A paper describes a structure:
We investigated a TRPM2 chanzyme from choanoflagellates that integrates two seemingly incompatible functions into a single peptide: a channel module activated by ADP-ribose with high open probability and an enzyme module (NUDT9-H domain) consuming ADP-ribose at a remarkably slow rate. Using time-resolved cryogenic-electron microscopy, we captured a complete series of structural snapshots of gating and catalytic cycles, revealing the coupling mechanism between channel gating and enzymatic activity. The slow kinetics of the NUDT9-H enzyme module confers a self-regulatory mechanism: ADPR binding triggers NUDT9-H tetramerization, promoting channel opening, while subsequent hydrolysis reduces local ADPR, inducing channel closure. The structures of srTRPM2 exhibit a characteristic TRPM architecture, from top to bottom, a transmembrane domain (TMD) layer containing the ion-conducting pore, a signal transduction layer consisting of MHR3/4 domain and the C-terminal rib helix, and an ADPR-sensing layer consisting of the N-terminal MHR1/2 domain and the C-terminal NUDT9-H domain.
The density of a representative bound cholesterol molecule is shown in the box. b, The ion-conducting pore in the apo (left) and Mg2+–ADPR-bound open (middle) states viewed parallel to the membrane, with plots of the pore radius along the pore axis (right). Before the onset of hydrolysis (substrate-bound state), both MHR1/2 and NUDT9-H domains are occupied by ADPR. Within NUDT9-H, the adenine group of ADPR is sandwiched by the indole group of W1264 and the phenyl group of F1372 via π–π stacking. Three Mg2+ cofactors (Mg1, Mg2 and Mg3) are bound between the two phosphate groups of ADPR and two acidic residues on the Nudix helix, E1386 and E1390. The extensive interactions between ADPR and the NUDT9-H domain strategically anchor both termini of the ADPR molecule, exposing only its α-phosphate (Pα) to solvent and making it readily accessible for nucleophilic attack. Indeed, we observed a putative water molecule bridging Mg2 and Mg3, as previously found in the crystal structure of NUDT5. On activation by Mg2+ ions, the water molecule is deprotonated by the catalytic base D1460 located in a loop close to the Nudix helix, and is poised for nucleophilic attack on the phosphorus atom of Pα.
Numbering used by the authors:
A (entry chain B): 435 to 533, 547 to 756, 787 to 1157
B (entry chain A): 917 to 1061
C (entry chain A): 628 to 675
D (entry chain A): 1110 to 1157
The structure:
């Protein structure tokens, strides 16, 4: 470089960089980058034959060079890349469910890998490729060189994240743009890659762990740049978090992060500030949970509530207070609480010989909830996303149970049997309703993380259920046969094997009842019996409760203790994710409570029929200007550079790095000392 | 007057901390207790007018069943099931679901919620255990003052 | 006395009423941390 | 007041002395000193 031989550097830099990528030497890839290594000027070693596909021919040379890497890595034994491509079940162009010579010779093309990674992130992530920017006619334009680098880097970035090479991935991440979003995408690909379907095996275990580790590192990156943003300009950082991105289908960054299950990104102050500001709306954050409830019950004493944000002020203040998501959450809680209390009263009180008034009110209420569930199904990202939530499963089961019970009662209201069967179904309804009421505990910092812990301990019970059945069924069959021999098998035998054995694990001993059933006539419980075999029941039981109450229950307590320590350490992260889910759910919620949401439903349906259809006049369009977009990109790159400089400075102050630096420096000091003594 | 002692003093502070842990437990249990109680009371005694006895019935057994005391003989007597096997020869088929609801309930209450509270207690003890000396010295000043 | 007063201001400042929000959490923690440092000072001089 | 100021000064001198005997501070001091040692070594070789 100093001696004017830059042309020779530029002539050999592409193949040398290519060789460095093939032989897994990241330090050499950085070294070359800056000395004019143009990532888009790569050339393949061999020449590809024509395949009569217009998409495959339109590709650039740098495009066949990312494939050759996949082929070289894939031909090695037990490579996860070949298994992933084979288990993807797609054709050469990446189209789903379409899997010859073309399918095997060009099985690792960049378009197909792009489709696999696109399907790997989410159902709506598309990276738009535009290879035309690599033509000589697009050269007089100023900023293209950046675009060509960024796109090229992105493709190499995806390749380096796949083979789990963090250092080369981080480097290519640095070369391109959209750093925060790319780090989240990288985290998502590594987490999904870590389980998938091909890597499930026991021997790949350490390997998948590595992936997870890499995953952690990339979100750490995603948090870090963001942090700089939060310490450079908070409002502009908030604008970045509210910004619609092109790769995902106009999803903001927090929604992308939630879809990528990045708990670290969601727990960050900037992200929490955006979610909290959206949560409280135009209400001062310092407003009591009590104050908003009282204001809900007393709307004309709400004028002195908190600093916010004649007719066009009082009306504006009412529309801002009742448009806030916090108020909607409080209204839904109270409303669901009345539903629980009123439905509980309805089930406890006797049914009349005709459909009563309270039954009609509950019928209107559950139709309204059914319409609200239908509204949630239409206005969402997908059916899978809706059905993923446990609360949606509980609300569908409660609506289904109520309608089965009502129709059971309503088929023949003047029937004693119909009332009894209907109340039996409505018992299940009240249990699921009170369980569904736990959704509103999630706002609290104590009550929220505990539900997540409860679903985790439900998983621990299932393991306990599998271990106990052995003892319960074995002891039950043995004990039931010893207590009542020479008796034909019936349903009572089946009820007898299961009833006592299960209830004896909770400390309730049926020894008086087992003494009565054994026909042992004596002051001492098992001596003067008709059969000598029944005297072994107290022994079997003696083994059984030692197995059940002392060993299995306490083993489950130990599993519970581990489960608590596990969800205890990330209780804050899980609460912050629930904070977003509350914020996201109540933004679209109509304000009116559940019985009265029919007026809101008919109002939205009337508005929907009127606007964005025939005879319409209302339409909204809010698109960000190009100037503010270029401001966010330059700001994001500057904060990316600031983080990495700060990160390097912080990493040089570590004990390991300082000891390493001190050791190498002393070795170099003795080299200089050897030179001195020679001079002397 | 236990506060002078180096063993007995820090334990009162720990007790007020575990009283705070109970309140959290009370909020979590009501869901199971009220739900199972309304469901079970309706299944045991159907077609009966609401009264104060209904309210006493929803709260009494469900709460005392979380301490290991099972009212199965009493629930068998109330279900009007006439048989050597406890729930077979009953007048109504709906009352045979009481042992099942209960089966879910005590799994939720005695095995999951009580042990979760024990885990909260263990954290609370480690928390007031490390600063037991500091809290005892503050109580020492409060006695002195 | 100033170190004790500093500790009191940081502990009261750490909760107060304005900093209650979820996003200020790391921030209030910092305050508590600072609080600890100042009483450490208050103890230390006293020790001498 | 004079006694308290004197003990404040004694604590801070003792605190600084204690903080210089920490592993992190000694490693940092050793690293900067070796860097300065090579600067002095560069000056020597030039003189030679
Ligand atoms: C998903 C969960 C919560 C719902 C479970 C389904 C419940 C509501 C259904 C499934 C099977 C049903 C039972 C099937 C048959 C009978 C016999 C009849 O003489 C009395 C009612 C009774 C005993 C039904 C009560 C309600 C019942 C238990
Ligand atoms: C390994 C463990 C968890 C086994 C699970 C225990 C379950 C399946 C057992 C334990 C107690 C059982 C109940 C005991 C008594 C009765 C009354 C009878 O008229 C109908 C069946 C019914 C309601 C049983 C249903 C099944 C039951 C709930
Ligand atoms: C290896 C393990 C299972 C230990 C084995 C111990 C078993 C076989 C022992 C322990 C208690 C024993 C019982 C104790 C007392 C009596 C009364 C006697 O008039 C007939 C035998 C009978 C009913 C015994 C049968 C064998 C018995 C069940
Ligand atoms: C230290 C502990 C574990 C002692 C072990 C307890 C064992 C040995 C005891 C506890 C309860 C006992 C049983 C109680 C009652 C009877 C009924 C009698 O007609 C035969 C013996 C038999 C079946 C006993 C066998 C021994 C027994 C199982
Ligand atoms: C998803 C969860 C709730 C599991 C569902 C299991 C429920 C629905 C099952 C388990 C035990 C069952 C009961 C067991 C036995 C009988 C006796 C029969 O003559 C009428 C039905 C009845 C009363 C059953 C009703 C349905 C029942 C309560
Ligand atoms: Mg960049
Ligand atoms: Mg829902």
């Amino acid at each position: 470089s100093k001696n004017g031989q830059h042309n020779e550097i530029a002539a050999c830099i592409n193949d040398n960089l290519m060789a460095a990528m093939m032989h897994n030497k990241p330090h050499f890839v950085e070294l070359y980058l800056g000395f004019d290594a143009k990532i888009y000027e790569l050339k393949p070693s061999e020449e590809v034959a024509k395949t009569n596909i217009t998409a495959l021919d339109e590709l650039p040379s740098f495009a066949l060079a990312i494939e050759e890497l996949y082929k070289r890595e894939a031909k090695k034994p037990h490579s996860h890349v070949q298994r992933l491509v084979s288990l993807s079940n797609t054709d050469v162009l990446g189209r789903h469910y379409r899997v010859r010579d073309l399918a095997n010779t060009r099985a690792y093309n960049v378009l197909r890998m792009d489709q696999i990674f696109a399907r790997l992130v989410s159902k709506d992530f598309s990276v738009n490729r535009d290879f035309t920017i690599y033509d000589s006619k697009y050269d007089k334009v100023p900023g293209i060189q950046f675009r060509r680098t960024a796109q090229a880097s992105h493709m190499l970035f995806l390749w380096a994240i796949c083979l789990d090479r963090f250092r080369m991935a981080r480097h290519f991440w640095l070369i391109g743009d959209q750093s925060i979003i790319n780090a989240l995408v990288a985290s998502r690909i590594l987490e999904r890659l870590s389980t998938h379907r091909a890597l499930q095996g026991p021997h790949l275990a350490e390997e998948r762990a590595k992936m997870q580790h890499n995953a952690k590192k990339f979100e750490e990156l995603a948090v870090g740049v963001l942090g700089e943003c939060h310490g450079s300009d908070s409002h502009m950082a908030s604008e970045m978090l509210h910004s619609k991105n092109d790769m995902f289908n106009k999803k903001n960054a927090i929604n992308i992060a939630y879809d990528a299950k990045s708990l670290a990104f969601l727990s960050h102050p900037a992200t929490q500030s955006v979610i909290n500001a959206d949560w409280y709306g135009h209400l001062k954050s310092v407003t009591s949970f009590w104050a908003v409830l009282f204001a809900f019950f007393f709307p004309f004493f709400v004028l002195p509530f908190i600093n916010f944000s004649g007719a066009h002020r009082l009306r504006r203040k009412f529309a801002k207070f009742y448009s806030a998501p916090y108020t909607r959450f409080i209204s839904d809680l109270l409303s669901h609480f009345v539903l629980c209390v009123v439905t509980s009263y309805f089930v406890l009180d006797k049914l009349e010989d005709t459909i009563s008034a309270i039954e009609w009110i509950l019928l209107v209420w559950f139709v309204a909830l059914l319409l609200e569930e239908l509204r949630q199904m239409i206005f969402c990202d997908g059916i899978a996303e809706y059905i993923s939530d446990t609360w949606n499963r509980l609300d569908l089961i409660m609506i289904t149970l109520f309608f089965v019970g009502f129709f059971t009662h309503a088929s023949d209201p003047s029937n004693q049997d119909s009332k009894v069967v209907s109340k039996g179904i409505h018992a299940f309804l009240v249990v699921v309703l009170w369980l569904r009421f736990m959704r509103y505990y999630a706002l609290s910092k104590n009550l929220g993380p505990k539900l997540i812990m409860m679903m985790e301990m439900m998983k621990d019970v299932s393991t306990f259920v599998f271990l106990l059945l052995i003892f319960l069924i074995g002891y039950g069959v043995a004990a039931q046969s010893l207590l009542s021999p020479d008796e034909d098998f019936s349903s009572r035998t089946f009820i007898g094997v299961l009833f006592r054995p299960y209830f004896q694990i909770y400390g309730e001993l049926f020894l008086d009842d087992l003494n009565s059933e054994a026909n042992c006539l004596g002051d001492t419980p098992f001596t003067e019996c008709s059969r000598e075999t029944v005297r072994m029941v107290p022994f079997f039981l003696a083994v059984y409760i030692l197995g059940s109450n002392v060993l299995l229950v306490n083993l489950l307590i130990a599993m519970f203790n581990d489960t608590y320590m596990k969800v205890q350490e990330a209780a804050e992260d899980l609460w912050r994710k629930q904070n977003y889910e509350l914020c996201a759910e109540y933004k679209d919620r109509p304000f009116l409570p559940a019985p009265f949401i029919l007026l809101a439903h008919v109002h939205m349906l009337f508005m929907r029929l009127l606007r964005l259809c025939g005879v319409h006049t209302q339409e909204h369009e809010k698109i960000q200007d190009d100037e503010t977009k270029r401001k966010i990109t330059t700001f994001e790159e500057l904060n990316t550079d600031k983080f990495l400089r700060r990160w390097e400075r912080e990493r040089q102050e570590m004990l390991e790095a300082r000891v390493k630096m001190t050791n190498d420096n002393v070795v170099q000091a003795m080299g200089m000392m050897d030179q001195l003594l020679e001079h002397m």
